[PDB]
Design a protein around this nucleic acid. Structure first.
Ligand code: MG
Ligand code: MG
Length: 758
DNA sequence: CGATCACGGGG
DNA sequence: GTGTACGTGATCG
């Protein structure tokens, strides 16, 4: 029909699957049901006669036997060649994992294909359905919670003490203690506060629920407390509860009929930050400071009843900026969903590698191209161990007035012009081919490759959008078209990386190597042209470079660099484009994707160096921050080396507060399941021995004490530490904490680990 | 050594 | 759900 598709899933009714398509039609929520779409896989057989044995293969599920309902001989393409496979139909999606191994094991079966595509994704592809089409306006609600937390408690032990939400009508706080603020609704209990959140969500009926780390905190915490309090959370538009899906080592939460938009994985991909706290994220995007009120300050205010107005304001600002950030980041995710043809829920939680793959699976269907399979563990491992031939060590020391150049828009044009594809690689009986420089891989020119063909269409579509943008008087159309052309740029600039992605179906080591080798000819041209203009290249990798004019005035460097980019792009043919990325007052480079810079507004920017994580001591993270600050803010490496030397001496003379030595590590499974007992497990087992209910999710704080052997046998629980009796291991905090934190940084200045002590 | 195990965001 | 991240660095055995 007419509506915008926002999501799709399936339900089972009388044992049979039913697809649900969630739509928004002129402001109204609509669900379309489809009972007719059938699950399937493909099987390549050694001979057609074999189908008679194969169609009779069975399996078991839900106490019932699983059978192949129908078989169909089909003509498709595999690796740019016609092939005949058998389409095997199944009644239920859950029949596919139950029977697939029993088909694959059969001696007459060469291989099986497309056996791990989720039903809802299979449906959108096969039916040619695209989410997020049209000008349909969605509604948004940001949600956040504050809880009572004490160090090392099991997840969900303390109550939720506040629930905040925000939309265009304002930011509000729901709490069960008396706070006199205009945006605070006081209720009688935690139970009544959670039921109030349920009522707000059911009444506001948002299409999109925005959270900041809601997948792994707000919603698992709400579900834990609702379970304890024996109450339901009917937040789904079908009155279903939020659903926790194990997505890797972490969680993802869905709300049926809506889009649960968690900003945390979204922003982590979009921008570069050493730490993605909401306060650091808000400041990077809106250029305004946001105060952080820490867990201990919140617990103290709740328990004493003093300073609750500050905690309520913190809760309110958390929802207010979550709404603001959601409106900022949602349009690009909506266009990416549309482009790749999968819902925002899925697209916002995936890498660019998986965005490419879903775009390719859809295009393979449209072109009757059988998809290759994801690799098994051994293949994936063999791919990670593959060595690529044919990006030097960066210049040492501290440089001033650094311009950053980006090469990424070069590679789609290389893939297309040289027909770089796994289906064109080293083709037999090829009349014409392109030979990659240095590496010598041959790509057949006789037919367009599957991936070059698609990229060519993407680039052409982006140029049409850019042309329609120049000719548009409507600023609403322009804004939308700007997002659409940026979505293409993002997807197209991900193919180069996708070729080398070990999990990729269309993985091609020789394709990735060849793109690099052809790419290098232009990079070498950019580098020679920069050096002829007095520029010194400080750092270069496949994504870009950093350069300066040694000792030149900063405005002269900026002007010359901007003039250079305009010049080289006038020389480069086709859609090959170099981009001026930015300018930095100072910076230094350690190795590949290990560097630190500082811009003219004094903001430090690093890659592959900062260690802001709870399993490193504060003394190591504080010393590291001080070293970066001495180098970038003071331009003084000598001050940085003196900071390390002073810290190490203070550690040796037991002059460092024990609180700066605490290491935190989470328990992730029952204690009896550990194969290797690390210091936090050794500490945990002693706590459980004393009667402490140790559970997965509990974070263990410990200090390493002086003594013989592995650190596991010398770690003490932070609560058991007695400064009068226990002596911390100075050698451990020096050699395993402080020195590894700074040694990579100071190696860029010619210092070895042994020169950072008195 | 190879294997195992943790980090992030959020209170 | 036709499912179970990612890349990297510390410590155990
Ligand atoms: Mg879903
Ligand atoms: Mg909050």
């Amino acid at each position: 029909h007419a509506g915008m598709i926002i999501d799709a899933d399936y339900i089972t009714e009388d044992g049979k699957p039913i697809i649900r398509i969630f739509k928004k039609e002129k402001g109204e929520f609509k669900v379309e049901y489809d009972r007719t779409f059938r699950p399937y896989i493909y099987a390549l057989l050694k001979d057609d006669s074999a189908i008679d044995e194969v169609k009779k293969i069975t399996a078991e599920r839900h106490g019932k036997i699983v059978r192949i309902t129908e078989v169909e001989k089909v003509q498709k393409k595999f690796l740019g060649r016609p092939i005949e496979v058998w389409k095997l139909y199944l009644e239920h999606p859950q029949d596919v994992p139950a029977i697939r191994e029993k088909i694959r094991e059969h001696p007459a079966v060469v291989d099986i294909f497309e056996y791990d595509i989720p039903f809802a994704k299979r449906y959108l592809i096969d039916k040619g359905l695209t989410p997020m089409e049209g000008n349909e306006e969605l509604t948004f609600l940001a949600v956040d919670i504050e809880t009572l937390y004490h160090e090392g408690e099991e997840f969900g032990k303390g109550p939720i003490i506040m629930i905040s939400y925000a939309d265009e009508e304002g930011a509000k706080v729901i709490t069960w203690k008396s706070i006199d603020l205009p945006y605070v609704e006081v209720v009688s209990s935690e139970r009544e506060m959670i039921k109030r959140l349920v009522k707000v969500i059911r009444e506001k009926d948002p299409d999109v629920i925005i959270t900041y780390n809601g997948d792994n905190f707000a919603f698992p915490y709400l579900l834990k407390r609702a379970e304890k309090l024996g109450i339901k959370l009917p937040l789904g538009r079908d009155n279903s509860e939020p659903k926790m899906q194990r997505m890797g080592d972490s969680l993802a939460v869905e709300i049926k009929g809506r889009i649960h938009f968690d900003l945390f994985p979204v922003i982590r991909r979009t921008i570069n930050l050493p730490t993605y706290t909401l306060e650091a994220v808000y400041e990077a995007i809106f250029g305004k400071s946001k105060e952080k009120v820490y867990a201990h300050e919140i617990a103290e205010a709740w328990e004493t009843g003093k300073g609750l107005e500050r905690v309520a304001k913190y809760s309110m600002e958390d929802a207010k900026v979550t709404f603001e950030l959601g409106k900022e980041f949602f349009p690009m995710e909506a266009q990416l969903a549309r482009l790749v043809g999968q819902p925002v829920w899925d697209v916002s939680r995936s890498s660019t590698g998986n965005l490419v793959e879903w775009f390719l699976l859809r295009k393979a269907y449209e072109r009757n191209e059988l998809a290759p399979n994801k690799p098994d563990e051994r293949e994936y491992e063999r791919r990670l161990r593959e060595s690529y031939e044919g990006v030097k060590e960066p210049e040492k020391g501290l440089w001033e007035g650094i311009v950053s150049l980006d090469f990424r828009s070069l590679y789609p044009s290389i893939i297309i012009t040289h027909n770089v594809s796994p289906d064109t690689l080293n083709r037999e009986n090829c009349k014409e081919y392109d030979v990659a420089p240095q590496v010598g891989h041959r790509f057949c020119k006789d037919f367009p490759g599957f991936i070059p063909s698609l990229l060519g269409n993407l680039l052409e579509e982006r140029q049409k959008i850019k042309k329609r943008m120049k000719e548009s008087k409507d600023p609403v159309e322009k804004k939308l078209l700007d997002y659409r052309q940026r979505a293409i740029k993002i997807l197209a600039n991900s193919y180069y990386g996708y070729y080398g992605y070990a999990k990729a179906r269309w993985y091609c080591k020789e394709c990735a190597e060849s793109v690099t080798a052809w790419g290098r000819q232009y990079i070498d041209l950019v580098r020679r042209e920069l050096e002829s203009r007095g520029f010194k290249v400080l750092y270069i990798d496949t994504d870009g470079l950093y350069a300066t004019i040694p000792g030149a005035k900063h405005e002269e460097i900026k002007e010359k660099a901007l003039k250079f980019v305009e010049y080289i792009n006038s020389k480069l043919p086709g859609l090959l484009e170099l981009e001026y990325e930015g300018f930095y007052a100072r910076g230094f480079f350690v190795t590949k994707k290990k560097y630190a810079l500082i811009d003219e507004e004094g903001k430090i920017v690093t890659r592959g160096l900062e260690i802001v994580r709870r399993d490193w001591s504060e003394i190591a993270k504080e010393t590291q921050a001080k070293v970066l600050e001495a180098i970038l803010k003071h331009g003084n490496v000598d001050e940085a080396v003196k900071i390390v030397k002073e810290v190490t001496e203070k550690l040796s003379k037991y002059e460092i507060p024990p609180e700066k030595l605490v290491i935190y590590e989470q328990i992730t499974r029952p204690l009896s399941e550990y194969k290797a007992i690390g210091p936090h497990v050794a500490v945990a087992k002693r706590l459980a021995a004393k009667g402490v209910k140790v559970k997965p999710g509990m974070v263990i704080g410990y200090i390493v004490l002086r003594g013989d052997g592995p650190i596991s046998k010398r770690a003490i629980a932070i609560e058991e530490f007695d400064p009068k009796k226990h002596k911390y291991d100075a050698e451990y905090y020096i050699e395993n904490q402080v020195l590894p934190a700074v040694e990579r940084i100071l190696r860029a200045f010619g210092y070895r680990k042994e020169d950072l002590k008195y």
